[PDB]
Protein backbone atom coordinates (compact mmCIF):
# COMPACT_ATOMS: atom_id res chain seq x y z
CA UNK A 1 0.00 0.00 0.00
CA UNK A 2 1.25 3.54 0.73
CA UNK A 3 4.97 3.78 1.53
CA UNK A 4 6.14 3.80 5.15
CA UNK A 5 9.54 2.13 5.57
CA UNK A 6 11.05 0.94 8.83
CA UNK A 7 14.83 0.64 9.20
CA UNK A 8 16.10 -1.46 12.10
CA UNK A 9 19.60 -0.22 12.91
CA UNK A 10 21.17 3.21 12.53
CA UNK A 11 24.64 2.09 11.60
CA UNK A 12 26.49 2.83 8.41
CA UNK A 13 23.80 1.03 6.43
CA UNK A 14 20.88 2.51 8.33
CA UNK A 15 21.92 6.17 8.17
CA UNK A 16 22.66 5.88 4.45
CA UNK A 17 19.19 4.45 3.88
CA UNK A 18 17.49 6.94 6.21
CA UNK A 19 19.11 10.02 4.68
CA UNK A 20 18.26 8.70 1.22
CA UNK A 21 14.58 8.17 2.09
CA UNK A 22 14.49 11.52 3.88
CA UNK A 23 15.86 13.24 0.77
CA UNK A 24 13.26 11.43 -1.35
CA UNK A 25 10.50 12.52 1.07
CA UNK A 26 9.58 8.85 1.52
CA UNK A 27 7.94 8.32 4.94
CA UNK A 28 10.10 6.17 7.19
CA UNK A 29 11.09 5.45 10.78
CA UNK A 30 14.70 4.72 11.77
CA UNK A 31 15.06 2.68 14.97
CA UNK A 32 18.23 2.23 17.00
CA UNK A 33 18.76 1.19 20.61
CA UNK A 34 21.30 4.04 20.95
CA UNK A 35 20.73 7.76 20.73
CA UNK A 36 23.59 8.36 18.34
CA UNK A 37 25.43 6.76 15.43
CA UNK A 38 28.94 5.45 16.14
CA UNK A 39 31.65 6.00 13.52
CA UNK A 40 33.39 2.93 14.89
CA UNK A 41 35.91 3.01 12.01
CA UNK A 42 37.73 5.73 13.98
CA UNK A 43 37.24 4.24 17.46
CA UNK A 44 40.87 3.03 17.54
CA UNK A 45 42.16 6.55 16.95
CA UNK A 46 39.60 7.65 19.56
CA UNK A 47 41.45 5.29 21.91
CA UNK A 48 44.86 6.99 21.47
CA UNK A 49 44.18 10.69 20.73
CA UNK A 50 42.84 13.01 23.42
CA UNK A 51 39.69 14.90 22.53
CA UNK A 52 39.00 12.80 19.43
CA UNK A 53 36.04 10.75 20.72
CA UNK A 54 33.59 13.65 20.37
CA UNK A 55 34.10 13.37 16.59
CA UNK A 56 32.81 9.76 16.45
CA UNK A 57 29.25 10.01 17.83
CA UNK A 58 26.42 11.75 15.94
CA UNK A 59 22.97 12.28 17.42
CA UNK A 60 20.11 10.73 15.46
CA UNK A 61 17.62 13.31 16.85
CA UNK A 62 19.37 16.29 15.30
CA UNK A 63 19.34 14.72 11.83
CA UNK A 64 16.07 12.79 11.70
CA UNK A 65 13.75 14.38 14.30
CA UNK A 66 10.40 12.62 14.17
CA UNK A 67 11.65 9.98 11.73
CA UNK A 68 13.81 8.55 14.54
CA UNK A 69 12.77 6.36 17.47
CA UNK A 70 15.24 5.19 20.10
CA UNK A 71 14.33 1.69 21.10
CA UNK A 72 15.30 -1.95 21.33
CA UNK A 73 13.69 -4.02 18.58
CA UNK A 74 12.68 -7.33 20.15
CA UNK A 75 11.02 -8.96 17.15
CA UNK A 76 9.35 -8.70 13.75
CA UNK A 77 5.64 -9.50 13.54
CA UNK A 78 5.41 -10.67 9.93
CA UNK A 79 1.72 -11.56 10.03
CA UNK A 80 0.84 -7.94 10.89
CA UNK A 81 3.96 -6.40 9.20
CA UNK A 82 5.19 -4.48 12.26
CA UNK A 83 8.49 -4.00 14.08
CA UNK A 84 8.19 -4.73 17.82
CA UNK A 85 9.98 -2.59 20.42
CA UNK A 86 10.68 -3.47 24.04
CA UNK A 87 7.99 -1.82 26.15
CA UNK A 88 5.17 -2.64 23.73
CA UNK A 89 5.39 -0.12 20.87
CA UNK A 90 4.82 -1.49 17.38
CA UNK A 91 5.78 0.21 14.11
CA UNK A 92 3.88 -0.82 10.95
CA UNK A 93 5.94 -1.05 7.78
CA UNK A 94 5.20 -1.22 4.09
CA UNK A 95 8.85 -2.22 3.68
CA UNK A 96 11.51 -3.30 6.15
CA UNK A 97 15.27 -2.70 5.96
CA UNK A 98 17.26 -4.85 8.38
CA UNK A 99 20.61 -3.13 9.10
CA UNK A 100 21.56 -4.56 12.50
CA UNK A 101 25.33 -4.68 12.17
CA UNK A 102 27.28 -6.74 14.67
CA UNK A 103 28.49 -6.81 18.25
CA UNK A 104 32.05 -6.71 19.48
CA UNK A 105 34.26 -5.54 22.32
CA UNK A 106 35.21 -2.01 23.11
CA UNK A 107 37.10 -0.08 21.70
CA UNK A 108 36.37 -1.45 18.21
CA UNK A 109 32.61 -1.45 18.83
CA UNK A 110 30.38 0.50 21.22
CA UNK A 111 27.12 -1.46 21.42
CA UNK A 112 26.21 -0.10 24.89
CA UNK A 113 23.18 2.10 25.44
CA UNK A 114 24.55 5.14 27.25
CA UNK A 115 24.52 8.93 27.16
CA UNK A 116 26.59 10.59 24.46
CA UNK A 117 28.66 12.09 27.28
CA UNK A 118 29.37 8.72 28.91
CA UNK A 119 30.22 7.22 25.50
CA UNK A 120 32.72 9.97 24.68
CA UNK A 121 34.12 9.71 28.21
CA UNK A 122 34.64 5.95 27.95
CA UNK A 123 37.09 6.61 25.12
CA UNK A 124 38.75 9.56 26.88
CA UNK A 125 39.16 7.17 29.82
CA UNK A 126 40.74 4.74 27.34
CA UNK A 127 43.25 7.33 26.09
CA UNK A 128 44.48 7.85 29.66
CA UNK A 129 44.85 4.10 30.25
CA UNK A 130 47.08 3.86 27.17
CA UNK A 131 49.10 6.93 28.12
CA UNK A 132 49.72 5.39 31.56
CA UNK A 133 50.86 2.04 30.19
CA UNK A 134 54.45 1.39 29.16
CA UNK A 135 53.72 -2.17 28.01
CA UNK A 136 50.52 -2.92 26.04
CA UNK A 137 49.13 -6.12 24.51
CA UNK A 138 46.66 -6.23 21.61
CA UNK A 139 44.85 -9.59 21.28
CA UNK A 140 43.86 -10.50 17.73
CA UNK A 141 45.88 -9.57 14.66
CA UNK A 142 43.02 -9.24 12.18
CA UNK A 143 42.34 -6.01 10.37
CA UNK A 144 41.17 -4.32 13.57
CA UNK A 145 44.10 -5.42 15.71
CA UNK A 146 46.84 -4.36 13.32
CA UNK A 147 45.38 -0.86 13.26
CA UNK A 148 45.15 -0.83 17.05
CA UNK A 149 48.77 -1.87 17.48
CA UNK A 150 49.85 0.57 14.77
CA UNK A 151 47.86 3.47 16.23
CA UNK A 152 49.46 3.05 19.65
CA UNK A 153 53.03 2.87 18.33
CA UNK A 154 52.49 5.92 16.09
CA UNK A 155 51.11 8.19 18.84
CA UNK A 156 53.49 6.85 21.51
CA UNK A 157 56.60 5.55 19.74
CA UNK A 158 58.29 4.90 23.10
CA UNK A 159 55.75 2.35 24.29
CA UNK A 160 56.23 -1.41 24.18
CA UNK A 161 53.37 -2.91 22.13
CA UNK A 162 52.92 -6.63 21.58
CA UNK A 163 50.37 -7.95 19.07
CA UNK A 164 49.37 -11.58 19.67
CA UNK A 165 47.61 -13.35 16.82
CA UNK A 166 46.52 -16.96 16.42
CA UNK A 167 47.07 -17.02 12.63
CA UNK A 168 50.32 -17.14 10.67
CA UNK A 169 49.41 -14.04 8.63
CA UNK A 170 47.96 -10.69 9.71
CA UNK A 171 44.63 -9.14 8.72
CA UNK A 172 41.90 -10.43 6.41
CA UNK A 173 42.70 -13.68 4.65
CA UNK A 174 41.04 -12.37 1.48
CA UNK A 175 43.69 -9.66 1.14
CA UNK A 176 46.43 -9.79 -1.46
CA UNK A 177 49.55 -11.49 -0.02
CA UNK A 178 51.56 -8.37 -0.87
CA UNK A 179 49.16 -6.25 1.21
CA UNK A 180 49.35 -8.56 4.22
CA UNK A 181 53.17 -8.60 4.04
CA UNK A 182 53.39 -4.79 4.04
CA UNK A 183 51.04 -4.67 7.04
CA UNK A 184 53.54 -6.86 8.87
CA UNK A 185 56.53 -4.90 7.59
CA UNK A 186 55.04 -1.58 8.71
CA UNK A 187 54.33 -2.96 12.18
CA UNK A 188 57.91 -4.19 12.57
CA UNK A 189 59.33 -0.92 11.22
CA UNK A 190 57.21 0.85 13.86
CA UNK A 191 58.71 -1.54 16.42
CA UNK A 192 55.58 -3.47 17.34
CA UNK A 193 56.45 -6.96 18.55
CA UNK A 194 54.62 -9.78 16.75
CA UNK A 195 53.57 -13.07 18.38
CA UNK A 196 52.08 -15.02 15.48
CA UNK A 197 50.41 -18.43 15.71
CA UNK A 198 49.63 -17.78 19.40
CA UNK A 199 46.21 -17.87 21.05
CA UNK A 200 45.80 -15.91 24.28
CA UNK A 201 44.41 -18.56 26.61
CA UNK A 202 43.48 -16.87 29.93
CA UNK A 203 41.21 -14.12 28.60
CA UNK A 204 38.72 -14.57 31.43
CA UNK A 205 41.27 -13.50 34.04
CA UNK A 206 42.55 -10.46 32.12
CA UNK A 207 41.29 -6.96 32.92
CA UNK A 208 40.61 -5.13 29.65
CA UNK A 209 41.06 -1.47 28.73
CA UNK A 210 42.47 -0.78 32.20
CA UNK A 211 46.00 0.17 33.17
CA UNK A 212 47.52 -2.10 35.79
CA UNK A 213 50.89 -2.57 37.45
CA UNK A 214 51.10 -6.20 36.31
CA UNK A 215 48.97 -8.27 33.92
CA UNK A 216 50.06 -11.82 33.10
CA UNK A 217 48.95 -12.85 29.60
CA UNK A 218 49.26 -16.55 28.75
CA UNK A 219 48.99 -18.37 25.41
CA UNK A 220 48.13 -21.88 24.26
CA UNK A 221 51.84 -22.53 23.61
CA UNK A 222 52.72 -21.45 27.16
CA UNK A 223 54.17 -18.06 26.28
CA UNK A 224 53.75 -15.47 29.03
CA UNK A 225 53.79 -11.72 28.36
CA UNK A 226 53.72 -9.23 31.20
CA UNK A 227 51.86 -6.03 30.37
CA UNK A 228 50.16 -2.92 31.73
CA UNK A 229 47.18 -2.92 29.37
CA UNK A 230 45.20 -5.49 27.37
CA UNK A 231 43.02 -4.57 24.38
CA UNK A 232 40.70 -7.09 22.71
CA UNK A 233 40.52 -7.07 18.89
CA UNK A 234 39.38 -10.67 18.54
CA UNK A 235 36.42 -10.14 16.18
CA UNK A 236 32.73 -9.36 15.88
CA UNK A 237 29.45 -11.28 15.65
CA UNK A 238 26.36 -10.55 13.56
CA UNK A 239 23.66 -9.04 15.79
CA UNK A 240 20.50 -10.99 14.96
CA UNK A 241 18.48 -10.13 18.11
CA UNK A 242 15.88 -8.12 16.17
CA UNK A 243 14.95 -10.76 13.58
CA UNK A 244 16.34 -14.21 14.45
CA UNK A 245 12.96 -15.61 15.61
CA UNK A 246 10.72 -14.35 12.80
CA UNK A 247 13.39 -15.14 10.17
CA UNK A 248 14.86 -18.32 11.71
CA UNK A 249 14.47 -20.34 8.50
CA UNK A 250 16.34 -17.73 6.41
CA UNK A 251 19.52 -17.37 8.46
CA UNK A 252 23.00 -18.47 7.48
CA UNK A 253 25.01 -20.08 10.25
CA UNK A 254 26.57 -16.67 10.97
CA UNK A 255 23.12 -15.28 11.81
CA UNK A 256 23.16 -13.26 8.60
CA UNK A 257 20.01 -13.18 6.49
CA UNK A 258 20.15 -14.94 3.12
CA UNK A 259 19.48 -12.47 0.29
CA UNK A 260 19.20 -12.45 -3.48
CA UNK A 261 21.04 -10.20 -5.95
CA UNK A 262 18.56 -7.42 -5.06
CA UNK A 263 19.26 -7.71 -1.28
CA UNK A 264 15.72 -8.95 -0.71
CA UNK A 265 15.65 -11.38 2.20
CA UNK A 266 14.90 -14.93 1.06
CA UNK A 267 11.14 -15.50 1.00
CA UNK A 268 10.20 -11.82 1.03
CA UNK A 269 9.66 -9.10 -1.55
CA UNK A 270 9.40 -6.20 0.92
CA UNK A 271 12.20 -7.10 3.36
CA UNK A 272 15.83 -6.14 2.69
CA UNK A 273 19.09 -6.83 4.54
CA UNK A 274 22.08 -4.46 4.33
CA UNK A 275 25.44 -4.13 6.03
CA UNK A 276 26.95 -6.83 8.18
CA UNK A 277 23.61 -8.57 8.75
CA UNK A 278 23.18 -9.47 5.06
CA UNK A 279 24.55 -12.87 3.95
CA UNK A 280 26.98 -11.58 1.33
CA UNK A 281 30.28 -13.28 0.63
CA UNK A 282 32.60 -10.43 1.63
CA UNK A 283 34.41 -8.99 4.66
CA UNK A 284 32.19 -6.93 6.92
CA UNK A 285 32.60 -3.30 5.85
CA UNK A 286 31.02 0.07 6.53
CA UNK A 287 31.93 0.89 2.93
CA UNK A 288 29.75 -1.94 1.60
CA UNK A 289 26.93 -1.20 4.05
CA UNK A 290 26.52 2.17 2.35
CA UNK A 291 26.47 0.55 -1.08
CA UNK A 292 23.83 -1.92 0.13
CA UNK A 293 21.70 0.97 1.37
CA UNK A 294 21.60 2.57 -2.10
CA UNK A 295 20.37 -0.70 -3.58
CA UNK A 296 17.75 -1.42 -0.92
CA UNK A 297 16.29 2.10 -1.14
CA UNK A 298 16.46 2.03 -4.94
CA UNK A 299 14.61 -1.30 -5.02
CA UNK A 300 11.86 -0.34 -2.59
CA UNK A 301 11.13 2.54 -4.96
CA UNK A 302 11.57 0.36 -8.04
CA UNK A 303 9.13 -2.19 -6.66
CA UNK A 304 6.36 0.34 -5.98
CA UNK A 305 6.95 1.79 -9.47
CA UNK A 306 6.55 -1.85 -10.62
CA UNK A 307 9.99 -1.62 -12.37
CA UNK A 308 12.66 -4.35 -12.41
CA UNK A 309 15.02 -4.32 -9.43
CA UNK A 310 18.67 -3.35 -9.43
CA UNK A 311 21.28 -5.98 -8.70
CA UNK A 312 24.30 -5.56 -6.49
CA UNK A 313 27.31 -6.02 -8.76
CA UNK A 314 30.11 -7.27 -6.46
CA UNK A 315 33.61 -6.77 -7.82
CA UNK A 316 37.16 -7.44 -6.66
CA UNK A 317 37.90 -6.56 -3.04
CA UNK A 318 38.62 -2.96 -2.01
CA UNK A 319 40.11 -2.69 1.48
CA UNK A 320 42.36 -0.06 3.11
CA UNK A 321 44.41 -0.64 6.29
CA UNK A 322 45.32 2.52 8.18
CA UNK A 323 48.63 2.04 10.02
CA UNK A 324 48.69 4.96 12.41
CA UNK A 325 47.87 8.42 11.05
CA UNK A 326 51.10 8.49 8.97
CA UNK A 327 51.10 5.14 7.17
CA UNK A 328 49.05 2.29 5.74
CA UNK A 329 48.48 -0.03 2.81
CA UNK A 330 45.58 -1.64 0.99
CA UNK A 331 43.98 -2.57 -2.31
CA UNK A 332 41.45 -1.19 -4.75
CA UNK A 333 39.49 -3.62 -6.90
CA UNK A 334 42.12 -6.26 -6.20
CA UNK A 335 45.21 -4.10 -6.85
CA UNK A 336 47.82 -2.99 -4.31
CA UNK A 337 47.98 0.65 -3.18
CA UNK A 338 50.65 2.15 -0.96
CA UNK A 339 51.39 4.63 1.79
CA UNK A 340 50.67 7.96 0.12
CA UNK A 341 47.21 6.91 -1.09
CA UNK A 342 46.07 5.10 2.05
CA UNK A 343 47.49 7.74 4.36
CA UNK A 344 45.67 10.55 2.53
CA UNK A 345 42.48 8.60 1.84
CA UNK A 346 41.98 6.78 5.16
CA UNK A 347 44.69 7.37 7.78
CA UNK A 348 44.38 11.14 8.11
CA UNK A 349 40.63 11.50 8.82
CA UNK A 350 39.44 7.83 8.99
CA UNK A 351 36.39 8.79 6.86
CA UNK A 352 34.96 10.80 9.78
CA UNK A 353 33.85 13.66 7.51
CA UNK A 354 31.68 11.29 5.47
CA UNK A 355 29.43 10.45 8.43
CA UNK A 356 28.90 14.08 9.43
CA UNK A 357 28.13 14.73 5.75
CA UNK A 358 25.49 12.00 5.65
CA UNK A 359 24.00 13.18 8.97
CA UNK A 360 24.03 16.85 7.80
CA UNK A 361 25.76 17.95 11.00
CA UNK A 362 29.14 19.54 11.77
CA UNK A 363 31.51 17.78 14.18
CA UNK A 364 32.14 19.54 17.46
C1 LIG B 1 35.69 -3.42 14.37
C2 LIG B 1 36.12 -2.58 13.20
C3 LIG B 1 35.39 -2.62 12.04
C4 LIG B 1 35.76 -1.85 10.92
C5 LIG B 1 36.90 -1.03 11.00
N1 LIG B 1 37.32 -0.27 9.95
C6 LIG B 1 36.61 -0.31 8.85
C7 LIG B 1 37.01 0.48 7.76
O1 LIG B 1 38.01 1.19 7.79
N2 LIG B 1 36.24 0.44 6.62
C8 LIG B 1 35.10 -0.34 6.53
O2 LIG B 1 34.45 -0.31 5.47
N3 LIG B 1 34.71 -1.12 7.55
C9 LIG B 1 35.42 -1.10 8.66
N4 LIG B 1 35.04 -1.88 9.72
C10 LIG B 1 33.82 -2.70 9.59
C11 LIG B 1 32.60 -1.92 9.98
O3 LIG B 1 32.72 -1.45 11.32
C12 LIG B 1 31.30 -2.69 9.77
O4 LIG B 1 31.31 -3.29 8.46
C13 LIG B 1 30.17 -1.66 9.85
O5 LIG B 1 29.97 -1.13 11.16
C14 LIG B 1 28.86 -2.26 9.38
O6 LIG B 1 27.78 -1.28 9.43
P1 LIG B 1 26.26 -1.78 9.60
O7 LIG B 1 25.36 -0.67 9.18
O8 LIG B 1 26.14 -3.13 8.97
O9 LIG B 1 26.20 -1.96 11.18
P2 LIG B 1 26.61 -1.01 12.39
O10 LIG B 1 27.26 -1.88 13.42
O11 LIG B 1 27.38 0.14 11.82
O12 LIG B 1 25.20 -0.47 12.95
C15 LIG B 1 24.28 -1.42 13.53
C16 LIG B 1 23.31 -0.70 14.43
O13 LIG B 1 22.14 -1.53 14.63
C17 LIG B 1 21.59 -1.23 15.90
N5 LIG B 1 20.82 -2.39 16.33
C18 LIG B 1 21.16 -3.71 16.19
N6 LIG B 1 20.26 -4.54 16.66
C19 LIG B 1 19.27 -3.71 17.16
C20 LIG B 1 18.05 -3.96 17.80
N7 LIG B 1 17.58 -5.18 18.04
N8 LIG B 1 17.30 -2.90 18.17
C21 LIG B 1 17.78 -1.67 17.93
N9 LIG B 1 18.90 -1.30 17.33
C22 LIG B 1 19.61 -2.38 16.97
C23 LIG B 1 22.78 -1.02 16.81
O14 LIG B 1 22.65 -0.26 17.99
C24 LIG B 1 23.80 -0.38 15.86
O15 LIG B 1 23.80 1.05 15.95
C25 LIG B 1 37.64 -1.00 12.21
O16 LIG B 1 38.73 -0.20 12.30
C26 LIG B 1 37.25 -1.75 13.30
C27 LIG B 1 38.04 -1.71 14.58
N1 LIG C 1 39.99 -1.83 6.90
C1 LIG C 1 38.76 -2.29 7.04
O1 LIG C 1 37.91 -2.19 6.15
C2 LIG C 1 38.43 -3.01 8.32
C3 LIG C 1 39.09 -2.76 9.52
C4 LIG C 1 38.79 -3.50 10.64
C5 LIG C 1 37.80 -4.44 10.57
N2 LIG C 1 37.17 -4.72 9.40
C6 LIG C 1 36.23 -5.87 9.28
O2 LIG C 1 35.54 -5.99 10.51
C7 LIG C 1 35.37 -7.39 10.80
C8 LIG C 1 36.04 -7.67 12.13
O3 LIG C 1 37.49 -7.51 11.98
P1 LIG C 1 38.42 -7.80 13.26
O4 LIG C 1 39.87 -7.70 12.91
O5 LIG C 1 37.92 -7.01 14.42
O6 LIG C 1 38.09 -9.34 13.54
P2 LIG C 1 38.53 -10.65 12.74
O7 LIG C 1 37.68 -11.80 13.17
O8 LIG C 1 38.57 -10.28 11.29
O9 LIG C 1 40.03 -10.88 13.26
C9 LIG C 1 40.27 -11.21 14.66
C10 LIG C 1 41.31 -12.30 14.74
O10 LIG C 1 41.66 -12.55 16.12
C11 LIG C 1 42.09 -13.88 16.22
N3 LIG C 1 41.91 -14.31 17.60
C12 LIG C 1 40.73 -14.64 18.22
N4 LIG C 1 40.87 -14.97 19.48
C13 LIG C 1 42.23 -14.85 19.70
C14 LIG C 1 43.03 -15.07 20.84
N5 LIG C 1 42.54 -15.44 22.02
N6 LIG C 1 44.37 -14.85 20.72
C15 LIG C 1 44.85 -14.46 19.53
N7 LIG C 1 44.20 -14.23 18.40
C16 LIG C 1 42.88 -14.45 18.55
C17 LIG C 1 41.17 -14.67 15.30
O11 LIG C 1 41.63 -15.90 14.77
C18 LIG C 1 40.90 -13.67 14.18
O12 LIG C 1 41.71 -13.91 13.03
C19 LIG C 1 35.96 -8.16 9.61
O13 LIG C 1 34.97 -8.47 8.63
C20 LIG C 1 36.95 -7.18 8.99
O14 LIG C 1 37.15 -7.27 7.59
C21 LIG C 1 37.43 -3.96 8.30
Residue numbers in the entry: 10 to 373
Task: Reproduce passages from the article.
In this study, we reported the crystal structure of hFSP1 containing FAD and NADH at a resolution of 1.75 Å, which is the highest resolution structure of FSP1 to date and will benefit drug development targeting FSP1. Only one molecule of hFSP1 is present in the asymmetry unit. The two RFDs include 6‐hydroxy‐flavin adenine dinucleotide (FAD) and nicotinamide adenine dinucleotide (reduced from, NADH), and the C‐terminal domain is responsible for substrate binding, which will be discussed later. The interactions between 6‐hydroxy‐FAD and hFSP1 arise mainly from the contribution of hydrogen bonds and hydrophobic interactions. While adenine interacts with V82 and S250, isoalloxazine interacts with A295, Y296, and K355. The hydrogen bonds found between the two phosphate groups and F21, G22, and D285 further contribute to the interaction of 6‐hydroxy‐FAD and hFSP1. Hydrogen‐bond interactions also appear to be the driving force for the interaction of NADH and hFSP1. The main chains of S175 and V209 are capable of hydrogen bonding with adenine, while the main chain of L329 stabilizes nicotinamide through hydrogen bonds. E156 is conserved and forms a salt bridge with K355, which stabilizes the hydrogen bond between the C4‐carbonyl of the isoalloxazine ring and the Nζ of K355. Y296 and F360 together clamp the quinone group of CoQ, and mutagenesis of Y296 and F360 disrupted the activity of hFSP1.
